[PDB]
C-alpha cells in the first residue's frame, strides 16, 4: 500500500490543480493547503474526477480503498499511480491520451474497465485481467488482439483501429455486445462462434461476406453502416432483429428483409435501391432511413403506419402522396427530389421536423397547420417550365406562393427582366436556350425558421 | 464525438479561408457532418452539410463561394471559403447532423473559430 505516517497537505499528495481542488471537496477540507491523514485518504472508495482538466494522477495511490474512478476527458498520459490500487473493479478513463497501460497489469479484480479514445497500441498489459466483463478500447491504434484471446468472461467488448485479425475472440463465447467499427476488418469467419451475441457493431470496415452471422440468431441490433455489402441474403435468418443498420453499401436487393417483421428501425441510406416493395410488410418499423438511393415509387411506404421518422434525401421522388397515411410521422427529411405538390403533407400535423429543400415546390399554403414544427428546410427549389417560343419580347407567369397563399415576387431575374404581378417579362437582344428568375422569402411555420427559395428555368425554342 | 475546429483567420473581401474540424471517435466515418456559423446576435445558420458518400448541402448564402470536403482517413471536415464577404464574419462550428440539409434542436457545435472578413 502507499501510506502516510504524519497528517500531510492535499497538495504536497495531489500535485495537479485540479485534482487537488476535486480531492479538498472529496476529503471536507476548506482548503488545498489543509492537512489530510491516512484515515482521510483510506475514506475514498469512489472517485468521479471527468473534465475538470487533470494532467496528472499523483496521489491517487494512496487512496488504496479505491473500487471506482472516474478520470473520462482529462489530458491524462502516465496511469503509474493505479498500479497497486489493487481493490479497483471499474475504471472510466476514456477521451484522455493514453498510451502505455502497462500500470493495469496486476488489477486482476478489475470487472469493467472503458479506455476508448486514447493513444493506445500495445494491449499485452489486459492479458491477465480475466474477471474484466466490459472492456472498451474503440478509437484507440491497436492493430492486434491476441492479448484479449483469454479474458473469457467479457459480455461488452469495442476496440479500434487497425484490427485485421479476428481469431483472438474465438474462445470468447460470453460476448453479448461487440462493436469491432473502425478497423480493416473483412473476414468475420470467427463472429459465427460468438452465439450469444445480442448486439454486433461493425461499421466502417471492409466486410463484403456476411454469410457468418447467418447463426447469430439472438442478435436483435446490427450495424454494418460503411462496408461493401451486396448480397444481404444471410439476414432472413435474424429473425428477432429490430434494428438494423446496413447505411453506405452496395445493396439493390431488399428481399432478404421482407419477413423480418420485428423490424421497428432499419436504416438503408447509401445503397443502390430502386424497389421498396420487400419493406411493404415490415409494419412494426417506426424509422425507415432510405437517403441516397433511387427511389422514385414510394407506394410501399404508405403500409407502414407506425413510421414517425423517415429519410428520403437525395432520390428521384415526383410523387410524396404515399406518406399521408403515416398518421404519426414527426420527422420527414427529402431534400433534394422532384416533389412538387406537397397537399398530401396537409394533415400530418404530427410533423415537428420538416425538410423538403432542393425540390420542385411553388406553393407552401398545404403547409399551414403543421403548427409542431420546430426544424424546417424550404430552400433552393427548382424546376423548368414547359418550353416557350424564342422572340425579343417574353413573358410567363410567376405562380410561386407562400403559406399565406400569397405570391412571392422574384427576387432576381435573368437577362434584365423585369415583373408586373403575375408576369416576368425579358427583352431579349438575341437567342438564348433559357432564362430565368429567382425568388427567396422568409417563412416560419410553428417554431421553425427557414428561407424558402427557388430557381425557375424557362427554356425559349428557337 | 470530440470536435475541434482550427483555422480561422482575417481576410480581406474577395480572399479565400480554410476551417477544419478534428474529429476523435468511430462516429464521424459513418455521420452527416455540417458547418454552422453564428454572429453576434444573430441566429445560427447551417452553411454546408455532407454525406459520407460525399452528397452535399449549401445554404442559399454560400452556395457557389464554399465546399465542404471530408477526409474519413484523417477524421478531418473541411470548409473551404473563397469571394469572402464582410457578411461572412461569424464563428464557424462542427457537429454531426440527422438531417444533410437543417439542423436539429439540440445539436453537439462545441467551441468554434472566428473568421473575420474585412471590407
Known amino acids: 500500500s502507499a501510506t502516510i505516517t504524519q497528517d500531510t497537505p492535499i497538495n504536497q499528495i495531489f500535485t495537479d490543480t485540479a485534482l487537488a481542488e476535486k480531492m479538498k471537496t472529496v476529503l471536507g477540507k476548506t482548503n488545498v493547503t489543509d492537512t489530510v491523514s491516512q484515515t482521510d485518504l483510506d475514506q475514498v472508495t469512489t472517485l468521479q474526477a471527468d473534465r475538470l482538466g487533470i494532467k496528472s494522477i499523483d496521489g491517487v495511490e494512496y487512496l488504496n480503498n479505491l473500487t471506482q474512478i472516474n478520470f473520462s476527458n482529462n489530458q491524462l498520459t502516465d496511469i503509474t499511480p493505479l498500479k497497486n490500487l489493487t481493490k479497483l473493479v471499474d475504471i472510466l478513463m476514456n477521451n484522455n491520451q493514453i498510451a502505455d497501460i502497462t500500470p493495469l497489469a496486476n488489477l486482476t479484480n478489475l470487472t469493467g474497465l472503458t479506455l476508448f479514445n486514447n493513444q493506445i497500441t500495445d494491449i499485452d498489459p489486459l492479458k491477465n485481467l480475466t474477471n474484466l466483463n466490459r472492456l472498451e478500447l474503440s478509437s484507440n491504434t491497436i492493430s492486434d488482439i491476441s492479448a484479449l484471446s483469454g479474458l473469457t468472461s467479457l459480455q461488452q467488448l469495442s476496440f479500434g483501429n487497425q484490427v485485421t485479425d479476428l481469431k483472438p475472440l474465438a474462445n470468447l463465447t460470453t460476448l453479448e455486445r461487440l462493436d469491432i467499427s473502425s478497423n480493416k476488418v473483412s473476414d468475420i469467419s470467427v463472429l459465427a462462434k460468438l452465439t450469444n451475441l445480442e448486439s454486433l457493431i461493425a461499421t466502417n470496415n471492409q466486410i463484403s461476406d456476411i454469410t457468418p452471422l447467418g447463426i447469430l440468431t439472438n442478435l436483435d441490433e446490427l450495424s454494418l453502416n460503411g462496408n461493401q455489402l451486396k448480397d444481404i441474403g444471410t439476414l432472413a435468418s435474424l429473425t428477432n432483429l429490430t434494428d438494423l443498420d446496413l447505411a453506405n453499401n452496395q445493396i439493390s436487393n431488399l428481399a432478404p428483409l421482407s419477413g423480418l417483421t420485428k423490424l421497428t428501425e432499419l436504416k438503408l441510406g447509401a445503397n443502390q435501391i430502386s424497389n421498396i416493395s420487400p419493406l411493404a410488410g415490415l409494419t412494426a418499423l417506426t424509422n425507415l432511413e432510405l437517403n441516397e438511393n433511387q427511389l422514385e415509387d414510394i407506394s410501399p411506404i404508405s403500409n407502414l403506419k407506425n413510421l414517425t421518422y423517415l429519410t428520403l434525401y437525395f432520390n428521384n421522388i415526383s410523387d410524396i402522396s404515399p406518406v399521408s397515411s403515416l398518421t404519426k410521422l414527426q420527422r420527414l427529411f427529402f431534400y433534394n427530389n422532384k416533389v412538387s405538390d406537397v397537399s398530401s403533407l396537409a394533415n400530418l400535423t404530427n410533423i415537428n421536423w420538416l425538410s423538403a429543400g432542393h425540390n420542385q415546390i411553388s406553393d407552401l399554403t398545404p403547409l399551414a397547420n403543421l403548427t409542431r414544427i420546430t426544424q424546417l428546410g424550404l430552400n433552393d427549389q427548382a424546376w423548368t417550365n414547359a418550353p416557350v417560343n424564342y422572340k425579343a419580347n417574353v413573358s410567363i407567369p410567376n405562380t410561386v406562393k407562400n403559406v399565406t397563399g400569397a405570391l412571392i415576387a422574384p427576387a432576381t431575374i435573368s437577362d434584365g427582366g423585369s415583373y408586373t404581378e403575375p408576369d416576368i417579362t425579358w427583352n431579349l437582344p438575341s437567342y438564348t436556350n433559357e432564362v430565368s428568375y429567382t425568388f427567396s422569402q422568409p417563412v416560419t411555420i410553428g417554431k421553425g425558421t427557414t428561407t424558402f427559395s427557388g430557381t425557375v428555368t424557362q427554356p425559349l425554342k428557337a | 464525438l470530440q470536435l475541434v475546429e482550427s483555422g480561422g483567420g482575417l481576410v480581406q473581401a474577395g480572399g479565400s479561408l480554410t476551417v477544419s474540424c478534428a474529429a476523435s471517435?468511430?462516429?464521424?466515418?459513418?455521420?452527416?457532418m455540417g458547418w454552422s456559423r453564428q454572429a453576434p446576435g444573430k441566429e445560427r445558420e447551417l452553411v454546408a452539410g455532407?454525406?459520407?458518400?460525399?452528397?452535399?448541402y449549401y445554404a442559399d448564402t454560400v452556395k457557389g463561394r464554399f465546399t465542404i470536403s471530408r477526409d474519413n482517413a484523417k477524421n478531418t471536415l473541411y470548409l473551404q471559403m473563397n469571394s469572402l464577404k464582410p457578411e461572412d464574419t461569424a464563428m464557424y462550428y462542427c457537429?454531426?447532423?440527422?438531417?444533410?440539409?437543417?439542423?436539429?434542436?439540440?445539436?453537439?457545435w462545441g467551441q468554434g473559430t472566428q473568421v473575420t472578413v474585412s471590407g
Open positions: 457537429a454531426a447532423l440527422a438531417d444533410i440539409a437543417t439542423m436539429g434542436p439540440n445539436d453537439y
Open positions: 471517435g468511430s462516429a464521424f466515418s459513418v455521420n452527416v
Open positions: 455532407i454525406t459520407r458518400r460525399g452528397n452535399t
